[PDB]
Amino acid sequence: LNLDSIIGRLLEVQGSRPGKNVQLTENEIRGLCLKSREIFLSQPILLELEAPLKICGDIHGQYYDLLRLFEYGGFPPESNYLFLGDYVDRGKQSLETICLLLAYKIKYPENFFLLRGNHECASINRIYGFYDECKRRYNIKLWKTFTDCFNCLPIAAIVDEKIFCCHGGLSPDLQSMEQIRRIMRPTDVPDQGLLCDLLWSDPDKDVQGWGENDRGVSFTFGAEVVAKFLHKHDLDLICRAHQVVEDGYEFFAKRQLVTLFSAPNYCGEFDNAGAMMSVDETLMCSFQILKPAKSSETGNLLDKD
Amino acid sequence: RKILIRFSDYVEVADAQDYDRRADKPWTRLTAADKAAIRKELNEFKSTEMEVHELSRHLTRFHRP
Ligand SMILES: [Mn+2]
Ligand SMILES: [Mn+2]
């Protein structure tokens, strides 16, 4: 794998007009998938990470915004990164986005981390754009290779024994962290259960306990659920993604949970900023935002009726 | 309970890229027949091709055609 060449070509379009594609070969992309998959399988499914770290939410194929985010935050390995999923679908350049993230995982495997979002599964990214982008530029077999890689992504991370990180949220089936550690890969994301909820659930200030989720998948959870969870596990913060928020970050339950969203002006239909949360070695958390100067929620389209 | 985390009181802001982020929405161009065929395609792919650990086969998400 000609990793350094791949990274240089991905970064070269920084100075170019937005939307310029990067001309990787099929075999280069396959190599990124296969080598990153091996590394994901060699590391825990529940990552145990240490600050300092920058944590980022959804990107959705907004490759030029990913480049801007790295320029703003520091290109790897100048800063360590944890991404919370939703790399592909519902943007114009899922391929460049995921290829750069996989390349950095391979290049800096102990300093760069990617969790699985609900779009990193076959049934969702078949329909929300990634399959079609793969077919236009390469072929369906390449999409199948990506699926094998995504099926091996880790599902959650804990930073310094105090920040619990996942794409979606809590689950009524999450009583012990060992239940996450026991999940074996490769795996799909199911339509219900613990692994679904970690990738799909949302907080809701008006739910007492667990509620239905209008995505048609998983649950909503209230502030008291968050407080009880943090207390039981001696954690200080849930850090998740999965919802567009106006400032790119948004607190829930008296700052016991934060939502991060890293794709500014999402899909050209929202006027939101994209943010990342920087955690220093003292566990002081700060936000860096890139601000422009339910329609957005993915649901149960393929299966409802 | 002692809390270790703290939050800065100052957020850093910079300008996002100025460009057209609108993207195609292929999922708006699916007939009922297209959706049935995609459900079948996914089922066949996950039944015959997609590798899944033995202890996770119960998590594979099949669709009702
Ligand atoms: Mn998303
Ligand atoms: Mn999501």
From TrEMBL, chain B:
UniProt similarity note: Belongs to the phosphatase and actin regulator family.
Portion of the parent chain present: 80 to 144 of 144
Subcellular locations according to the entry: Cytoplasm; Nucleus; Synapse
Top-level taxonomic group: Eukaryota
Lineage: Eukaryota, Metazoa, Chordata, Craniata, Vertebrata
Protein name: Phosphatase and actin regulator
The protein's assembly and partners: Binds PPP1CA and actin.
